[PDB]
């Protein structure tokens, strides 16, 4: 569901192969998945 919301974000066309390869880069780079999770709520009203 966390991966699904990311893929959902694909406002562009694709294929089953591209999607699997994206999940693969994410599975082998947990620090990248952490950034996407942190960016999802990083926006806040300052000053």
């Amino acid at each position: 569901s966390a991966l699904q919301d990311l893929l959902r974000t694909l406002k562009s066309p694709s294929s089953p192969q591209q999607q699997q390869q994206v999940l693969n880069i994410l599975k082998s780079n947990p620090q990248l998945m952490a950034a996407f999770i942190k960016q999802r709520t990083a926006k806040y009203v300052a000053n």
Binding site: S15, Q17, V22, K38
Partner: protein, 191 residues
Amino acid sequence: LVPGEEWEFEVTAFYRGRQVFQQTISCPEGLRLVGSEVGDRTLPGWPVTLPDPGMSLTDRGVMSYVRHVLSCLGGGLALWRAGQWLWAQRLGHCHTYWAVSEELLPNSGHGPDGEVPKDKEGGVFDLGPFIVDLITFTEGSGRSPRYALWFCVGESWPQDQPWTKRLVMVKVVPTCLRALVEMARVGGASS
């Protein structure tokens, strides 16, 4: 040689700045840009045939040169992933120059990143630095990481001139990298 690193590539070819071809292929052995019949199988990698300039171009003088270039491609231009690197190797008679750039190559005459080796493969793209900068991009660095590979086939790299005047330019894009950058952008990141 080991499965788990298969990448889908979108190949776009331009004859004199004119898009004449575009195909997307996901092959475990990477691919090879050939300019002919699709025969000699002794070579590894999925053969992607560039079209004859006749069915798109009208100029007959240009069809001439492109046809010669495509003919000197022989084994072709091999490209494949292995580890954290993208590898390329030239198997024919035409020198090929590459550079990593934006989806749309800019005429910022700066010269090529290098030349594709013929004797042994050479690395043309490192996934490591790409992810490092993809992460800071999501943080706000404002600099989207590049992932598009551009190849000048048969002529020197168009440094002082517009690439659209080159006989054969090929743009290769690893679609998963394009997607990762788009998700970082839609997630709230700007350049």
